[PDB]
């Protein structure tokens, strides 16, 4: 379960970057570890 799915646009001398952040609640009995990675195949984001 995922909440607060913010894009977090930044505009910099190097160019644009996304630093967005979200809050996730796991399933029971899981030990998520630092820099573990998630993808959400149902959800598509627009980019240019």
């Amino acid at each position: 379960a995922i909440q607060s799915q913010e894009k977090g646009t930044n505009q910099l001398d190097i160019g644009i970057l996304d630093t967005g952040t979200a809050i996730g609640t796991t399933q029971l009995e899981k030990r998520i570890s630092y820099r573990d990675r998630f993808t959400v195949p149902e959800v598509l984001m627009p980019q240019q």
Partner: protein
């Protein structure tokens, strides 16, 4: 002239960077002091014609995302005027002269002269490569052609040379008015891999050393001086940090204008007038 150090650096760095990266043994020589694995990984990734990654160059503040794997960001800096001439007269000319040029050319026979043809009208000839003419050779320049006596030189009827010369704009008198400026540009090699940042630093220093011999910064942009910053995270709050090591390139150059003089005097005349008091 008026000059733009940033656009000069962009125009000069991009082709040189490409021509080094397409040539494996050059990188193998530049990176000889690095750790073996750093060297081989860089050469595998970015170097040679088959390289799947690529480096990029551009000015700061673009509106789009860049290739943060390896990107040279060019960033126009400070400057100040340093030395002035009396009357601000940087020079004077009898014939409005353009940029300096070097062009390859070949001799041809024409009417028992040898001639070299050049793409533009020759305002001044500085050097015909590997030739010093005697008075007997009857060296003459006319329009966009250099001409050279055939009689004793028949062996050279197809000789290949480089001509160093400069354009003419027009036949006019004037004063070059201006001053010298000392100006800074910063360049930083961005990468999210620190070993790539260190290799991009090495490659950039090599490129600038090679650049010191170019006609552009021999005639203008003189006294290249380099300073180097710490390696640091440029951006720190992505999914990963982006690192870079700044370098500052400082140049001394002339800012000036062609003040043309329309006044010309072609005859004095004398008269005596009598004072009867």
């Amino acid at each position: 002239a008026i000059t733009s150090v940033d656009s000069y650096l962009l125009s000069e760095i991009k082709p040189r960077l490409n021509t080094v990266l397409e040539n494996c043994y050059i990188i193998d020589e530049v990176l000889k002091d690095f750790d073996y694995q750093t060297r081989e990984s860089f050469k595998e990734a970015f170097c040679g014609k088959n390289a799947q990654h690529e480096v990029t160059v551009g000015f700061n503040f673009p509106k789009f995302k860049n290739n943060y794997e390896a990107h040279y960001l060019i960033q126009l800096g400070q400057g100040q005027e340093t030395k002035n001439s009396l009357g601000s007269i940087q020079s004077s000319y009898f014939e409005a002269t353009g940029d300096t040029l070097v062009e390859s050319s070949t001799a041809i026979r024409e009417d028992d002269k040898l001639v070299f043809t050049v793409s533009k009208p020759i305002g001044e000839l500085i050097k015909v490569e590997d030739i010093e003419f005697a008075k007997y050779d009857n060296l003459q320049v006319e329009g966009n052609k250099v001409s050279f006596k055939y009689q004793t030189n028949e062996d050279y009827e197809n000789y290949n040379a480089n001509i160093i010369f400069t354009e003419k704009k027009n036949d006019s008198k004037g004063l070059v008015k201006g001053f010298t400026v000392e100006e800074q540009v910063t360049v930083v090699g961005l990468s999210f891999n620190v070993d790539v940042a260190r290799c991009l630093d090495a490659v950039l220093k090599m490129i600038l050393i090679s650049m010191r011999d170019s006609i552009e910064e021999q005639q203008t942009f003189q006294l290249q001086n380099l300073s180097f910053g710490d390696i640091a995270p440029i951006i720190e709050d992505g999914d990963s940090m982006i690192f870079g090591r700044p370098t500052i390139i400082k140049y001394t150059s002339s800012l000036d204008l062609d003040y043309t003089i329309t006044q010309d005097i072609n005859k004095l005349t004398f008269k005596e007038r009598k004072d009867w008091k």
